Symmetry: C2
Subunit: 309 residues, 2 copies
């Protein structure tokens, strides 16, 4: 079967209700779609984000911060989310696989991702985490050196450095599990950020799609699946020349970018990740589509925007 890396969205897992129960229930539905891919003969390699979750955990660190109960730094918080989310996801997957009568092991591996300490991201935090706050709440929280940015008509959120992944420490272990036909969950929340050969933890949160892209390269995956809310990457949305991109090449995508398409903060990064993967090695494809859309995939019918070349 074809090896595909799929990165689940942290904001998809926690779309509203922040309770463990609500998130666990969401992953139950996510798992049905993923199992569907397993039934179509595909080999699953899973990862996930943690924006909402890590921001919330951080607030808990602060709520009781004291010498007797010290707040855990961001790198350890990411590690904790690899545990909570990895548990919820692996537990949900196992339940669905059992019901379906599919004998397949699922395993979550804590993952440390190496980044460049000179990364520009460290002096320009941009990844929003935690809950949306009012301007007043944002200013009050900035007194603690924290940096906040506003999302048009949504509120303010704490932003953190989001450096680029250059290597995955446990990559060889993940490969071994894949070779033994085990469904792996790794690079949780983008991966525990570390630098140097000593793997010193740094406070940041890596973007799941770029961590996944890097993972896909290291495990020699066949396809990288980047998730969105719709079925196809759409240009000129809501305009007479609206167009849903189906099968496209890298060249075509570059042409679209040069024409000003793809929002810089949402879609552009996804397009960039897709291009990077397709240009990494021969015979590689990137699929940008919805979770629901993958749950409809029949054999090779890969609905969604498929990038090649």
């Amino acid at each position: 079967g074809k090896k595909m890396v799929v990165a689940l969205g942290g904001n998809a897992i926690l779309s509203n209700d922040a309770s463990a129960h609500a998130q666990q229930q969401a992953l139950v539905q996510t798992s049905a779609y993923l199992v569907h891919l397993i039934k179509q003969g595909h080999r699953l390699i899973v990862s996930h984000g943690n924006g909402p979750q890590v921001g919330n955990l951080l607030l808990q660190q602060q709520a009781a911060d004291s010498e007797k109960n010290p707040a855990m730094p961001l790198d350890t918080c990411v590690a904790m989310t690899q545990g909570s989310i990895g548990y919820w996801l692996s537990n949900a997957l196992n339940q669905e696989l059992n019901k379906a009568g599919i004998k397949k092991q699922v395993a979550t591996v804590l993952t440390q991702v190496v980044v460049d300490p000179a990364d520009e991201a460290f002096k320009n935090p941009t990844k929003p985490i935690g809950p949306f706050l009012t301007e007043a709440e944002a200013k009050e929280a900035m007194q603690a050196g924290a940096i906040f940015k506003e999302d048009a008509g949504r509120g303010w959120r704490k932003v953190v450095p989001s450096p680029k992944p250059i290597d995955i420490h446990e990559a060889e272990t993940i490969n071994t599990l894949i070779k033994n036909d085990i469904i792996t969950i790794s690079c949780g929340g983008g991966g525990i950020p570390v630098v140097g050969q000593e793997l010193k933890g740094v406070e940041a949160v890596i973007d799941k799609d770029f961590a996944s892209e890097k993972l896909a390269e290291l495990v020699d995956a066949d396809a990288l699946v980047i998730l969105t809310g719709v079925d196809y990457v759409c240009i000129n949305y809501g305009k007479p020349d609206e167009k849903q991109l189906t099968n496209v090449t890298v060249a075509e995508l570059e042409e679209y970018k040069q024409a000003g398409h793809f929002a810089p903060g949402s879609m552009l990064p996804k397009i960039e990740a897709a291009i990077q993967f397709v240009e990494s090695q021969p015979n590689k494809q990137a699929i940008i589509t919805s979770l629901e859309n993958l749950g409809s995939m029949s054999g090779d019918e890969i609905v969604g925007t498929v990038v090649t070349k």
Copy 2:
């Protein structure tokens, strides 16, 4: 080389300082000793407790509890500790392996441990977690239904259900990693407690030593190593008949236990875990000694209480 399961104590990781760096630093020293075993050619299989850590995390969950940032249930908290402590230990091991010039991969696997939902532990919370409180503070901590118990001369701590492990969901995966010469860390904090084929999470904290004994059986380990603060299990401490057990058999221990030796909430359980492992399969050994002794082992020779039969 022997397959040796070593269960690290959470109270040994977080002794006097609750900060992440202090625990990371404690794990570094611990790893120096573990790497020594690896140098002898043995195959290290690691596990660890989380009493202090999960209790502190639970307090943070409580401190910010609200509909927007709800406290995570105890099973999810255990999962989170598998992440934090797993991160610290795997990072520390890598460090000490690099120092010894030994190239081996380390991997932490999230572990769900099955327990009997009818276990008496669910109507009798007994495992102490978190910080020590004064009697007065304990009383204030018991206004919402929690249960705290006293440790003579040390203080009061919250106690939770601690059922017996009956299976490890990720056993086959952990064994596959062992077969691939990867140093594994699993059953973190005793394992995420679940029940039934559905693996329904339940609120409890499993004892690392019993979780390790079960793992040892499932991966057909050669030796189960239970850690204590001393070199030999000592009986009649400070008495004309004080004896330090070196090489004992199950029959002898049951005889001692019959006499009334071993403390109910410390040594007795360790003794029981050792017995269970030795009786589980032929040619198995259980070693009760200190971490320092492990770091002084030479080949198969080690200084501590060795149980066989």
